Design a protein around this ligand. Sequence first.
Ligand code: CLA
Ligand code: LUT
Lengths: 212, 217, 230, 205
Amino acid sequence: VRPVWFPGNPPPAHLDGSLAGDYGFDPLFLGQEPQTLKWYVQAELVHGRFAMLGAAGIILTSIGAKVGLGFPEWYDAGKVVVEKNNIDFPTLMVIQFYLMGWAETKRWYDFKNPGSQADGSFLGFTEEFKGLENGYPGGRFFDPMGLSRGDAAKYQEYKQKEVKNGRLAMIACLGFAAQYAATGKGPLDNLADHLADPNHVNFATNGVSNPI
Amino acid sequence: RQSWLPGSQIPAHLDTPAAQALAGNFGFDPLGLGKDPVALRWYQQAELIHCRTAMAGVAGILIPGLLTKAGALNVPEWYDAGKVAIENSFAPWGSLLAVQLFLCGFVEAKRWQDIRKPGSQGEPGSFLGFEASLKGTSELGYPGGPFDPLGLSKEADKWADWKLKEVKNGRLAMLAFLGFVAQKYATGAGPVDNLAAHLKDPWHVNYATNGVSLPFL
Amino acid sequence: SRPLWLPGSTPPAHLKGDLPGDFGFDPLGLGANAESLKWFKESELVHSRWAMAAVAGILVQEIVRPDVFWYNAGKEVESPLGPLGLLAVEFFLMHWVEVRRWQDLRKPGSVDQDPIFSQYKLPPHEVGYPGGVFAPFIPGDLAELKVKEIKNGRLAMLAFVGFVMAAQVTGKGPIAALQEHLADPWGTTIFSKAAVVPGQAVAPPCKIPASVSYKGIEIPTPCFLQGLWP
Amino acid sequence: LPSWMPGADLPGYLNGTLPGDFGFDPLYLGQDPVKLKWYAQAELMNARFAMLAVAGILVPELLSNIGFSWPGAGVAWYDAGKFEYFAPASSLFGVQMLLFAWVEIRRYQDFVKPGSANQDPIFTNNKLPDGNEPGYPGGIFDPFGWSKGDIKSLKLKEIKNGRLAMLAFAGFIGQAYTTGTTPLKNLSTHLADPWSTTVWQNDLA
Ligand code: CLA
Ligand SMILES: CC1=C[C@H](O)CC(C)(C)[C@H]1/C=C/C(C)=C/C=C/C(C)=C/C=C/C=C(C)/C=C/C=C(C)/C=C/C1=C(C)C[C@H](O)CC1(C)C
């Protein structure tokens, strides 16, 4: 048997175990249609990748912030980076939308037509924008070291590791958000605060978490 | 074939031997206007005329606009060229507009009757003798004879390339003129000065900063 | 199977024994693709050779001309040559050499001929080991000297990163650091300078300064990965 | 068999018939043979006007530093438009355009129909020989008895010197726009101190 998200319940019919991180977790049956499930697969992978990258950013910047280097904490870095160098806010946002819109649109229309961008329309590139699977766009640009086309079972292991770490990162970033909303301080500052007095500094003491 | 959006389903009316034989076909019809081949014919005529007059107008804006930053050709700004011209001129603007209405209506009537009937304007005795060379050249919108004096339209190997250059430069010209209008209402100076003020400080002077082009930020 | 690292273990299925100095060390599987493995082979060879030359440079530079801090040396040696001129000569010359070598990589057996003097032609080779005028003679045999060069290279690369951190913690050269460590082995190690406890964490102070004013326009000088030291 | 990148694949449409065929077209500008013909003729003409131009900028300045006394005493090459001639520049432009209209339209008439502009319209005995070669006229345009040798070598040489002169005149424009001085003075201050007079050095001001 597979390990299920809830030992004892059989897994739903549309979830089999061919995917990565497949634990049969779908109580609302949101992914019953195969196209909808395929789209949600891509959604989970993208959210996970941005979450991993973001939480790495938060943790590293906070490590640099507690030690006396002069880094701002993550709720202040936007203001001080825009303010301190010279940068006009809206032009930066607009260029963000330019580049992100270009690449993200390429991804969208590669989902609609699965092998369309490998035609040569972009400057000269062929078979380096052809996708490998759903949400795994491995070529020379996106898998430069070349891990996807060797050691297939070990590659399945890498898929499993990616999905697990991504989910952990997503709930980690949610942790950063709600944690800052509750305590109003930096995250690794909270880690050191809880690590100094574990029995008396936790969520059951802020007065905001449990209002009883 | 090229498409505007690689991977997008090209509509079936732009995928025919009749529609692929058109200059600058790139399968761009999100709002499905050209479902009627007659309507597509008429719209192609509209695109060609707009291309040609757009190129002429935008060239008239730019070339005096550029050369006035050099020494010669003291030309006023394009949004003030009329006033100064009419103060230079000899007649009031009403009579000039009337005369151009007449002299342009005659010609546009000609061209229109050639659109409704392809071999129309050449039939014996109609004009005083230019009926000889007022037929079409088998592709509507591209007449011959007294048009194309230099004979560039005779060789068959450069044909589609001359066409395609025309339509591409024309589309770019229409975009340019719409840009002239918007830059006039947005910043309040000549287009050459907008180019200079943007090259001088790119990361600070654009439409994210002019305070009108997007007011919500 | 000769020995292997962590002896008794099993090598990966893609490493067999064709290459010099392969011992089955790929837990990440970064050499599954042959087309990757050729590029990474060349990468290892080139990094090893640069590191060997640089480590010998640092040692001999300290030995012959002591009290010239190699980590500062750019702020030092400045000559009647301008630094801009030196940068130019380096740019053009090294650009030529690297482009030639890379052309040999991506298209094998093409750049073997001298362009100017059309008589001389480099003989056929195996990639990464050109030979010819690049090696006048072999003392010993080839297949052993390949192993020896890879071993001395990997050791040298580790030696250079050791030099960098050994400068960014102490602030002295390599041999001077060795003298300091032999002066008090129990008291001068990396474990004797810094530690992390769930209570508190302490790191060594950075000996190396901030932005360095070379010629007015200052060069910002950070230490590598400042915030994660012990 | 020479290349611009020894080992890299050359485009298929280049075959050495053109002078100086080194297989260089990373943008694929000459796929159609018609564009190849027009581009080849354009290259020849741009090359010849470049060579005459660079000669006309070197020789006056080279003979300026030696110190003769014709009134072209080294004024500039870009200050040739503020000098008293014996005619204002307007009539110069007029006569220039008339004569060059005659010559250039004649040359174009040779290019469109090769073998048709050979004979002198006025004195109808004088006629070019039948070695037409559109772009390489012959006859009195090769008056001193050359073209005896294997002319592919001389064509190759002409195109090489032409390309070098085109890059040279681009150099004159660039240098005179940036440093705003005369070019042999640029070579003078570069031979004064080669290590503190470079492009990277000057562009940091
Ligand atoms: C310049 C770096 C470099 C590169 C590119 C290689 C490349 C290679 N080595 Mg190699 N090696 C190196 C340095 C390097 N080596 C050093 C310094 C040592 C001594 C520790 C060794 C010891 C070693 C052994 C013992 C073996 C190899 C083998 C191999 C080959 C197959 C493994 C593979 O795919 O790795 C590809 C390598 C990379 C993709 C580089 C990864 C760089 C990562 C991403 C950076 C992160 C490193 C991290 C910061 C830790 C730093 C160390 C710290 C102490 C500073 C391959 C050609 C095996 C072999 O010969 O089989 C053919 C083998 O048996 N190497
Ligand atoms: C394609 C399509 C298809 C699908 O189906 C749908 C959709 C998408 C919707 C569509 C799109 C569309 C579009 C976009 C369009 C645009 C247009 C334009 C822009 C035009 C202009 C156009 C423009 C134009 C003509 C212009 C013209 C101009 C002119 C004359 C000018 C004149 C002038 C001059 C010279 C100068 C003087 O001093 C004054 C003036 C008087 C000012």
